[PDB]
Design a protein around this ligand. Structure first.
Ligand SMILES: [Cu+2]
Ligand SMILES: [Cu+2]
Ligand SMILES: [Cu+2]
Ligand SMILES: [Zn+2]
Ligand SMILES: [Zn+2]
Ligand SMILES: [Zn+2]
Ligand SMILES: [Zn+2]
Ligand SMILES: [Zn+2]
Ligand SMILES: [Zn+2]
Lengths: 336, 336, 336
């Protein structure tokens, strides 16, 4: 059970909100699963008013890509920090044991890379995030976090041990953003990442985000970019929040089976209307669509969702079921 | 199991904090349970300093009345929006499947009504709330939410399946209010509901409520309006919070059995000191009183409870039990 | 099962973060366990910038000491309020039944003491806190809270009933502080406790702490005062938050078994990355160290931890395990 001698497999990561191809239940034995991520600092437009964020990302996206392995596997990540970045970075896996989650072994300055291996000995969805000494919160709130999903080798199970399956998985990273405003009441636009620092820490200390977004920007998961599913399909919704609590809800849907603390050896709860993702964690919910149409998937602090940005859509195809819901009488004049 | 052919029964709703008469375990088979609610926009005094809220309610109260059905029943609601209101409304049931919880099928302008039917296929306490396109949070924080309680046909059960009963049920809706202040530091008083809109959204975006109240106003559940019980009686406390998290606590009491996520097919937790209601959900706790006196039932963010309003009282009659608690020595001079 | 006739034992309390010596599983039958606490109002330096807090404490510390008993025992506390204090105090045990948790029977003015006895009939970690009529939140946020740990007579158990043991226990009280600032942007320093009142309530109503600290001050559990353990040792981390939610996380570690709502008759959850302590409660986590080094134990709202103070360290001795984590390649130039 010595990793140096086990089979190694390289996985190509995909951008959120998709999740790379993977097995749920597997007959494979433990492997060393190798991944690579390249840090990209970049200015991003995060709303439809032209507001920018001096952002920091793993692999160019918020959140970074989800890495999927099985319980008993070893994660082996090569973390690259190009010379075109200005700051030092690292990675802290909440699914790993020791050395500040791997942060102490992955400190990389612009122009450097490092490779970390850790045993993924516990099943569940876990946050990973950057955590450079002296500026931990700034790197995390600027976009550096994603999820490691460690599946049970047997796939997911209900409280009685019955198999649970998903047909499609989506990953939603929710980001509380702290964009500074100048004395004119407009959001500041910085020329460099380092310029935004001091102002940003002052907004952070208020504990009041200027924006709260799914996947890098207001409305990121809407329009052409809406999530999709079909009636009859079971979706796994992974939701990570590395800094602040959130409370996911599917409008017109449910959390059929939910691991809100995100740890698959614990029995899931069923029939949830709204679940809770503790800041610093990732959780997962399964839902099997039974009705077609456009659903909203959102943080059910409704101010945070509708005013600040924490809401996406899921467009679902299929047949309407009047036994589950029916309009008996459409809107019409009150009988007088 | 076609609702069109099932027996229909009409239920008369009662104002919070009571809950309409209903059975727990029932021998009845599935029914279509019909309810009616009329929306009332009205200015309300919400504190004892004369502060007003341009409020929006279902049936004239905050929260709206609790509707009680059994798992497998169909809820059939007629939603009326009189011409004396100024805004359009709808209803989103978190206990319903599809069409944005029914909101898409219940859009009613002043002078209109509509009737929605949905299968209540999951047990638990669920929030219902208004959700008109473009102004979802304003309608919810202005007072439009209540609970749908779907009881298991067999009544409530503990983790081992033993029957649990309540003698009386109370419904507590907790509302985070965002009342604007003018430049003189006083809460603004508006002539119309529409006048309060813009100022209200600015306060909402700060995420800091001006007041947090149970059942429409500071001290609503105190004095003549305190909840009541007797030693030996088991109470079911339903607590809904449609927009913001809260953490209920009974001072001098416990959550004997609690479903904090509010979904009765999951095993309850026992002996809770304080439980947690996620914004966008309703939860339920059972407690059997063992001591008489005046208890406080509150949000245990104590600033939110004592400074902002989120606290009520329960006056309990009966005999004091010195085996559970006794004053050994009353306050007296320190022995010198 | 009449307490007046049972054996009485006096326990000497110890300062946080230690916990007085006690048994886990015990063959003892029910006892009356007697404790004494003396209230101390005192000005404390709470950060490294010279900021002071007009603090209020049980036994001179924040949090007050943890009291440990077994399920079925009676807690008998003598609460002393010296004449050198300026305010009246009391104590509300969340582990007690009736009389506002004992607050109604322990109102003591400066120069008085009182003795309360209550049956500790439920297992779990429970908050105790001061709660004087009319100024409940001020006394709690100024430092008056600690934990009562009621262990099952059989010791802690996992979800299947297997015994769980800890080798060492630590108690962490997390305090959201509301220090006023004057017009010059500097934290105010008061000559007396009563002087700080009005300004403090205004900061409290904003719901934004100026500081959030573990055990009375930024960095209290760091340096010479860091918690300690060894590889192979199982630690019990008790975390109390009497006013505000928090989300504990061990960097590079886990919550192997966690009772986040803190009530030991409920099955714990395993493998948690981050858990949640509801304001007004205490929870407990067990972790068996598997790697040596310096860990951080923190509130995983990272702004609250790193900017506001809610973070401590645990220094762990022992052997590094390259099978759990290994640096495959140290930071070095990117291959060109
Ligand atoms: Cu970074
Ligand atoms: Cu409305
Ligand atoms: Cu006090
Ligand atoms: Zn399927
Ligand atoms: Zn972390
Ligand atoms: Zn009864
Ligand atoms: Zn909703
Ligand atoms: Zn041990
Ligand atoms: Zn309390």
């Amino acid at each position: 059970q010595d990793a140096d001698k086990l089979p190694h497999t390289k996985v190509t990561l995909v951008a959120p909100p998709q999740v790379h191809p993977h097995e749920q239940a597997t007959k494979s034995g433990p492997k060393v699963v190798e991944f690579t991520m390249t840090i990209e600092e970049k200015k991003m437009v995060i709303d439809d008013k032209g507001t920018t964020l001096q952002a920091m990302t793993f692999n160019g996206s918020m959140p970074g890509p989800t890495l999927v392995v099985h319980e008993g596997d070893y994660v082996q990540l090569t973390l690259v920090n190009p010379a075109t970045n200005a700051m030092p970075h690292n990675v802290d896996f909440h699914g790993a044991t020791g050395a500040l989650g791997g942060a102490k072994l992955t400190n990389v300055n612009p122009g450097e890379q490092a490779t970390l291996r850790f045993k993924a000995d516990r099943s569940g969805t876990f946050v990973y995030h950057c955590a450079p000494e002296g500026m931990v919160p700034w790197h995390v709130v600027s976009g550096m976090s994603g999820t490691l999903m460690v599946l049970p080798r047997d796939g997911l199970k209900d409280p009685q041990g019955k198999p649970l399956h998903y047909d499609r998985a989506y990953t939603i990273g929710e980001f509380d953003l702290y964009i500074p405003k100048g004395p004119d009441g407009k959001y500041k636009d910085y020329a460099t990442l380092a310029e935004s620092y001091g102002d940003t820490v002052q907004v952070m200390r208020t504990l009041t985000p200027s924006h709260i977004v799914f996947n890098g920007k207001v409305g990121a998961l809407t329009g052409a970019n809406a999530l999709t599913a079909k009636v009859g399909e079971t979706v796994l919704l992974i939701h990570s929040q590395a800094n602040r609590d959130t409370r996911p809800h599917l409008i017109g849907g449910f959390g059929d089976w939910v691991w809100e603390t995100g740890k698959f050896a614990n029995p899931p709860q069923r029939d949830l209307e709204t679940w809770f993702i503790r800041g610093g964690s990732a959780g997962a919910a399964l839902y099997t669509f039974k009705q077609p149409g456009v659903y909203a998937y959102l943080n059910h602090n409704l101010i945070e969702a509708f005013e600040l940005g924490a809401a996406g859509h899921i467009k679902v195809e299929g047949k309407w079921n009047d036994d589950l819901m029916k309009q008996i009488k459409a809107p019409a004049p009150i009988p007088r």
